[PDB]
Protein backbone atom coordinates (compact mmCIF):
# COMPACT_ATOMS: atom_id res chain seq x y z
CA UNK A 1 0.00 0.00 0.00
CA UNK A 2 0.81 3.64 -0.43
CA UNK A 3 1.26 5.02 3.07
CA UNK A 4 -0.57 8.28 3.74
CA UNK A 5 0.49 10.39 6.71
CA UNK A 6 -2.50 11.73 8.66
CA UNK A 7 -1.79 14.36 11.31
CA UNK A 8 -3.83 16.09 14.01
CA UNK A 9 -3.24 17.97 17.26
CA UNK A 10 -5.21 15.94 19.81
CA UNK A 11 -3.94 12.55 21.01
CA UNK A 12 -5.06 9.36 19.29
CA UNK A 13 -7.55 8.77 22.10
CA UNK A 14 -9.80 11.69 21.19
CA UNK A 15 -12.62 12.76 18.92
CA UNK A 16 -10.08 13.56 16.16
CA UNK A 17 -8.38 10.21 16.67
CA UNK A 18 -11.72 8.42 16.40
CA UNK A 19 -12.45 10.33 13.19
CA UNK A 20 -9.02 9.69 11.71
CA UNK A 21 -9.14 5.96 12.51
CA UNK A 22 -12.65 5.52 11.12
CA UNK A 23 -11.66 7.34 7.96
CA UNK A 24 -8.40 5.42 7.57
CA UNK A 25 -9.96 2.03 8.24
CA UNK A 26 -12.66 2.62 5.59
CA UNK A 27 -10.13 3.86 3.03
CA UNK A 28 -7.93 0.80 3.53
CA UNK A 29 -10.87 -1.58 3.05
CA UNK A 30 -12.54 0.42 0.31
CA UNK A 31 -9.36 0.71 -1.73
CA UNK A 32 -8.36 -2.94 -1.25
CA UNK A 33 -5.10 -1.98 0.50
CA UNK A 34 -3.97 0.43 -2.22
CA UNK A 35 -3.84 3.04 0.56
CA UNK A 36 -3.19 2.82 4.31
CA UNK A 37 -2.76 5.52 6.96
CA UNK A 38 0.09 6.19 9.32
CA UNK A 39 -1.20 8.41 12.17
CA UNK A 40 0.72 11.41 13.57
CA UNK A 41 -1.28 12.63 16.56
CA UNK A 42 -0.29 15.25 19.13
CA UNK A 43 1.11 17.68 16.57
CA UNK A 44 3.98 15.35 15.60
CA UNK A 45 3.86 16.96 12.12
CA UNK A 46 3.28 20.40 13.62
CA UNK A 47 0.27 22.46 14.63
CA UNK A 48 -2.77 22.98 12.41
CA UNK A 49 -1.50 26.00 10.46
CA UNK A 50 1.77 24.25 9.56
CA UNK A 51 -0.08 21.00 8.71
CA UNK A 52 -2.57 22.69 6.38
CA UNK A 53 0.29 24.50 4.69
CA UNK A 54 2.02 21.16 4.14
CA UNK A 55 -1.14 19.51 2.80
CA UNK A 56 -1.59 22.37 0.31
CA UNK A 57 2.03 21.98 -0.78
CA UNK A 58 1.72 18.19 -0.96
CA UNK A 59 4.37 17.41 1.62
CA UNK A 60 1.76 16.08 4.05
CA UNK A 61 -0.98 13.73 2.83
CA UNK A 62 -3.86 14.22 5.27
CA UNK A 63 -4.99 16.33 8.20
CA UNK A 64 -8.04 16.32 10.53
CA UNK A 65 -8.08 20.01 11.47
CA UNK A 66 -10.40 22.61 13.00
CA UNK A 67 -11.25 25.65 10.90
CA UNK A 68 -9.02 27.77 13.16
CA UNK A 69 -6.11 28.54 10.83
CA UNK A 70 -7.90 27.20 7.71
CA UNK A 71 -9.26 30.65 6.92
CA UNK A 72 -5.67 31.78 6.30
CA UNK A 73 -5.75 29.61 3.18
CA UNK A 74 -9.45 29.74 2.30
CA UNK A 75 -10.90 32.98 3.75
CA UNK A 76 -14.50 32.02 3.02
CA UNK A 77 -14.41 29.32 5.73
CA UNK A 78 -14.16 31.92 8.49
CA UNK A 79 -17.91 32.60 8.15
CA UNK A 80 -18.46 29.58 10.41
CA UNK A 81 -16.09 31.01 13.03
CA UNK A 82 -18.37 33.95 13.88
CA UNK A 83 -19.32 34.01 17.58
CA UNK A 84 -22.91 32.99 18.40
CA UNK A 85 -23.78 32.25 14.78
CA UNK A 86 -24.97 28.72 15.61
CA UNK A 87 -27.67 27.88 18.17
CA UNK A 88 -26.85 24.25 18.99
CA UNK A 89 -25.34 21.03 17.58
CA UNK A 90 -28.41 20.16 15.47
CA UNK A 91 -28.20 23.58 13.82
CA UNK A 92 -24.45 23.54 13.23
CA UNK A 93 -24.31 20.00 11.93
CA UNK A 94 -27.17 20.58 9.49
CA UNK A 95 -25.42 23.64 8.06
CA UNK A 96 -22.09 21.84 7.63
CA UNK A 97 -23.74 18.82 6.06
CA UNK A 98 -26.03 20.84 3.80
CA UNK A 99 -25.41 23.03 0.74
CA UNK A 100 -23.60 25.76 2.71
CA UNK A 101 -21.01 23.38 4.15
CA UNK A 102 -20.67 21.54 0.83
CA UNK A 103 -19.90 24.83 -0.94
CA UNK A 104 -17.13 25.57 1.56
CA UNK A 105 -15.53 22.19 0.77
CA UNK A 106 -15.51 23.13 -2.94
CA UNK A 107 -13.97 26.53 -2.13
CA UNK A 108 -11.22 24.67 -0.27
CA UNK A 109 -10.71 22.26 -3.15
CA UNK A 110 -10.14 25.18 -5.55
CA UNK A 111 -7.14 26.20 -3.38
CA UNK A 112 -5.55 22.71 -3.44
CA UNK A 113 -7.03 21.65 -0.10
CA UNK A 114 -9.21 18.66 -0.88
CA UNK A 115 -11.76 18.82 1.94
CA UNK A 116 -13.44 15.42 1.96
CA UNK A 117 -16.01 15.98 4.72
CA UNK A 118 -16.76 18.18 7.70
CA UNK A 119 -16.05 16.36 10.91
CA UNK A 120 -16.35 18.16 14.25
CA UNK A 121 -14.38 19.79 17.03
CA UNK A 122 -17.35 21.16 18.95
CA UNK A 123 -18.69 24.23 20.70
CA UNK A 124 -15.83 26.10 22.37
CA UNK A 125 -15.79 27.15 26.04
CA UNK A 126 -13.64 29.59 28.03
CA UNK A 127 -11.15 28.43 30.65
CA UNK A 128 -8.86 30.53 32.81
CA UNK A 129 -6.75 30.52 35.97
CA UNK A 130 -7.79 33.85 37.51
CA UNK A 131 -11.54 33.97 38.18
CA UNK A 132 -14.97 32.55 37.36
CA UNK A 133 -16.55 33.84 34.15
CA UNK A 134 -20.29 34.42 34.68
CA UNK A 135 -20.86 37.29 32.25
CA UNK A 136 -18.97 39.06 29.44
CA UNK A 137 -17.61 41.72 31.79
CA UNK A 138 -15.82 39.01 33.84
CA UNK A 139 -13.71 38.17 30.78
CA UNK A 140 -12.55 41.77 30.38
CA UNK A 141 -8.85 42.12 31.03
CA UNK A 142 -8.00 38.44 30.77
CA UNK A 143 -5.17 37.45 28.47
CA UNK A 144 -6.55 34.58 26.43
CA UNK A 145 -4.85 32.47 23.79
CA UNK A 146 -6.81 32.21 20.54
CA UNK A 147 -6.29 30.15 17.42
CA UNK A 148 -4.59 31.74 14.42
CA UNK A 149 -7.88 33.22 13.27
CA UNK A 150 -8.65 36.91 12.73
CA UNK A 151 -12.41 36.43 13.18
CA UNK A 152 -11.92 34.89 16.61
CA UNK A 153 -9.45 37.61 17.54
CA UNK A 154 -11.69 40.48 16.41
CA UNK A 155 -14.80 38.81 17.82
CA UNK A 156 -13.40 37.93 21.22
CA UNK A 157 -11.93 41.43 21.66
CA UNK A 158 -15.51 42.66 21.99
CA UNK A 159 -15.70 40.69 25.29
CA UNK A 160 -12.79 42.78 26.60
CA UNK A 161 -10.39 39.82 26.40
CA UNK A 162 -6.84 40.41 25.21
CA UNK A 163 -6.14 37.77 22.50
CA UNK A 164 -2.80 36.27 21.54
CA UNK A 165 -2.83 33.79 18.64
CA UNK A 166 -0.78 30.62 19.29
CA UNK A 167 -0.37 27.27 17.60
CA UNK A 168 -1.97 24.53 19.69
CA UNK A 169 1.21 22.67 20.63
CA UNK A 170 2.52 25.79 22.45
CA UNK A 171 -0.68 26.25 24.44
CA UNK A 172 -0.12 23.93 27.45
CA UNK A 173 3.21 25.55 28.34
CA UNK A 174 1.76 29.04 27.82
CA UNK A 175 -1.02 28.23 30.30
CA UNK A 176 1.39 26.59 32.74
CA UNK A 177 3.83 29.54 32.83
CA UNK A 178 1.02 32.09 33.00
CA UNK A 179 1.95 33.75 29.74
CA UNK A 180 -1.81 33.90 29.20
CA UNK A 181 -4.55 33.54 31.82
CA UNK A 182 -6.74 31.33 29.68
CA UNK A 183 -7.90 29.82 26.43
CA UNK A 184 -10.99 28.38 24.84
CA UNK A 185 -11.75 24.96 23.34
CA UNK A 186 -14.44 22.29 23.16
CA UNK A 187 -14.80 19.79 26.00
CA UNK A 188 -13.29 17.01 23.78
CA UNK A 189 -10.06 19.05 23.58
CA UNK A 190 -10.01 20.13 27.21
CA UNK A 191 -10.42 16.49 28.27
CA UNK A 192 -7.93 14.95 25.86
CA UNK A 193 -5.24 17.55 26.49
CA UNK A 194 -5.46 17.57 30.29
CA UNK A 195 -5.80 21.36 30.58
CA UNK A 196 -7.37 20.67 33.96
CA UNK A 197 -3.78 20.50 35.18
CA UNK A 198 -3.18 24.16 34.39
CA UNK A 199 -6.69 25.76 34.32
CA UNK A 200 -8.82 26.14 37.45
CA UNK A 201 -11.91 27.63 35.81
CA UNK A 202 -14.29 26.56 33.06
CA UNK A 203 -17.39 28.41 31.81
CA UNK A 204 -19.81 26.86 29.34
CA UNK A 205 -19.93 29.96 27.17
CA UNK A 206 -20.41 27.97 23.94
CA UNK A 207 -19.29 31.11 22.12
CA UNK A 208 -18.39 29.59 18.75
CA UNK A 209 -18.93 26.33 16.94
CA UNK A 210 -15.67 24.74 15.79
CA UNK A 211 -16.06 22.41 12.85
CA UNK A 212 -13.21 20.12 11.83
CA UNK A 213 -12.50 18.70 8.38
CA UNK A 214 -10.54 15.82 6.87
CA UNK A 215 -8.34 17.31 4.15
CA UNK A 216 -6.33 15.37 1.54
CA UNK A 217 -3.54 16.91 -0.55
CA UNK A 218 -4.39 17.65 -4.16
CA UNK A 219 -1.13 15.82 -4.99
CA UNK A 220 -2.64 12.53 -3.78
CA UNK A 221 -6.22 13.21 -4.86
CA UNK A 222 -5.16 13.74 -8.47
CA UNK A 223 -3.38 10.36 -8.49
CA UNK A 224 -6.58 8.52 -7.42
CA UNK A 225 -8.89 6.60 -9.71
CA UNK A 226 -12.42 8.05 -9.96
CA UNK A 227 -13.63 5.03 -7.96
CA UNK A 228 -11.10 5.62 -5.17
CA UNK A 229 -12.06 9.31 -5.01
CA UNK A 230 -15.58 8.17 -4.12
CA UNK A 231 -14.20 5.78 -1.47
CA UNK A 232 -12.19 8.55 0.22
CA UNK A 233 -15.24 10.85 0.41
CA UNK A 234 -17.54 8.09 1.69
CA UNK A 235 -14.90 7.13 4.25
CA UNK A 236 -14.68 10.75 5.46
CA UNK A 237 -18.48 10.94 5.84
CA UNK A 238 -18.43 7.79 7.96
CA UNK A 239 -15.72 9.50 10.06
CA UNK A 240 -18.04 12.46 10.56
CA UNK A 241 -20.55 10.22 12.29
CA UNK A 242 -18.03 8.48 14.55
CA UNK A 243 -16.30 11.75 15.42
CA UNK A 244 -19.53 13.55 16.34
CA UNK A 245 -20.55 10.53 18.44
CA UNK A 246 -17.33 10.91 20.41
CA UNK A 247 -17.94 14.65 20.80
CA UNK A 248 -21.38 13.73 22.20
CA UNK A 249 -19.89 11.18 24.63
CA UNK A 250 -17.14 13.57 25.74
CA UNK A 251 -19.68 16.20 26.67
CA UNK A 252 -22.16 13.94 28.46
CA UNK A 253 -19.42 12.66 30.75
CA UNK A 254 -16.68 15.29 30.57
CA UNK A 255 -18.00 17.93 32.95
CA UNK A 256 -18.20 15.40 35.79
CA UNK A 257 -14.62 14.23 35.14
CA UNK A 258 -13.28 17.79 34.93
CA UNK A 259 -14.98 18.56 38.24
CA UNK A 260 -13.33 15.50 39.81
CA UNK A 261 -10.02 16.84 38.43
CA UNK A 262 -10.58 20.04 40.42
CA UNK A 263 -11.99 22.43 37.82
CA UNK A 264 -14.57 24.97 39.00
CA UNK A 265 -17.28 24.82 36.38
CA UNK A 266 -19.84 27.51 35.59
CA UNK A 267 -22.58 25.69 33.70
CA UNK A 268 -24.94 28.63 33.17
CA UNK A 269 -23.48 31.92 32.00
CA UNK A 270 -25.21 35.18 31.08
CA UNK A 271 -25.32 34.42 27.39
CA UNK A 272 -27.16 37.62 26.58
CA UNK A 273 -24.20 39.65 27.85
CA UNK A 274 -21.85 37.96 25.38
CA UNK A 275 -24.22 38.23 22.45
CA UNK A 276 -24.79 41.92 23.07
CA UNK A 277 -21.02 42.47 23.30
CA UNK A 278 -20.26 40.89 19.92
CA UNK A 279 -23.11 42.48 17.99
CA UNK A 280 -21.04 45.46 16.82
CA UNK A 281 -18.52 43.11 15.14
CA UNK A 282 -21.26 41.84 12.82
CA UNK A 283 -20.77 45.02 10.74
CA UNK A 284 -17.30 43.75 9.84
CA UNK A 285 -18.49 40.13 9.53
CA UNK A 286 -21.29 41.03 7.10
CA UNK A 287 -19.00 43.22 5.02
CA UNK A 288 -16.58 40.34 4.64
CA UNK A 289 -18.90 37.36 4.26
CA UNK A 290 -22.21 38.86 3.11
CA UNK A 291 -25.16 39.52 5.43
CA UNK A 292 -27.20 37.20 3.24
CA UNK A 293 -24.75 34.34 3.80
CA UNK A 294 -24.89 34.92 7.57
CA UNK A 295 -28.67 34.96 7.40
CA UNK A 296 -28.76 31.79 5.26
CA UNK A 297 -26.83 30.00 7.99
CA UNK A 298 -29.12 31.38 10.72
CA UNK A 299 -32.25 30.24 8.82
CA UNK A 300 -31.28 26.57 8.80
CA UNK A 301 -33.34 24.50 11.28
CA UNK A 302 -34.89 27.73 12.63
CA UNK A 303 -38.23 27.03 14.28
O1 LIG B 1 -7.45 25.17 19.88
C1 LIG B 1 -7.07 24.68 18.80
O2 LIG B 1 -5.99 24.98 18.20
C2 LIG B 1 -7.96 23.58 18.18
O3 LIG B 1 -9.23 23.55 18.87
C3 LIG B 1 -7.25 22.22 18.35
O4 LIG B 1 -6.04 22.31 17.56
C4 LIG B 1 -8.14 21.07 17.80
O5 LIG B 1 -8.59 21.34 16.45
From TrEMBL:
<protein>
    <submittedName>
        <fullName>TRAP dicarboxylate transporter, DctP subunit</fullName>
    </submittedName>
</protein>
<feature type="binding site">
    <location>
        <position position="48"/>
    </location>
    <ligand>
        <name>D-erythronate</name>
    </ligand>
</feature>
<feature type="binding site">
    <location>
        <position position="16"/>
    </location>
    <ligand>
        <name>D-erythronate</name>
    </ligand>
</feature>
<feature type="binding site">
    <location>
        <position position="124"/>
    </location>
    <ligand>
        <name>D-erythronate</name>
    </ligand>
</feature>
<feature type="binding site">
    <location>
        <position position="185"/>
    </location>
    <ligand>
        <name>D-erythronate</name>
    </ligand>
</feature>
<feature type="binding site">
    <location>
        <position position="121"/>
    </location>
    <ligand>
        <name>D-erythronate</name>
    </ligand>
</feature>
<feature type="binding site">
    <location>
        <position position="145"/>
    </location>
    <ligand>
        <name>D-erythronate</name>
    </ligand>
</feature>
<feature type="disulfide bond">
    <location>
        <begin position="24"/>
        <end position="37"/>
    </location>
</feature>
<feature type="modified residue" description="Pyrrolidone carboxylic acid">
    <location>
        <position position="1"/>
    </location>
</feature>
<keyword id="KW-0873">Pyrrolidone carboxylic acid</keyword>
Amino acid sequence: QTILKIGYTPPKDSHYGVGATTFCDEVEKGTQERYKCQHFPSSALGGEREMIESVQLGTQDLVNTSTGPLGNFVPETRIVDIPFLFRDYEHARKVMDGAIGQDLLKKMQAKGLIGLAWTENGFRHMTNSKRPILQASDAAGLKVRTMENKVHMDGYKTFGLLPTPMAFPELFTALQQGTVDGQENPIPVILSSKFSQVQKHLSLTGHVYSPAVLILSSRVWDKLSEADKKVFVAAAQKATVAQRKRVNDDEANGITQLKKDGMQVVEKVDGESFRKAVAPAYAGFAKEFGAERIAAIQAVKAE
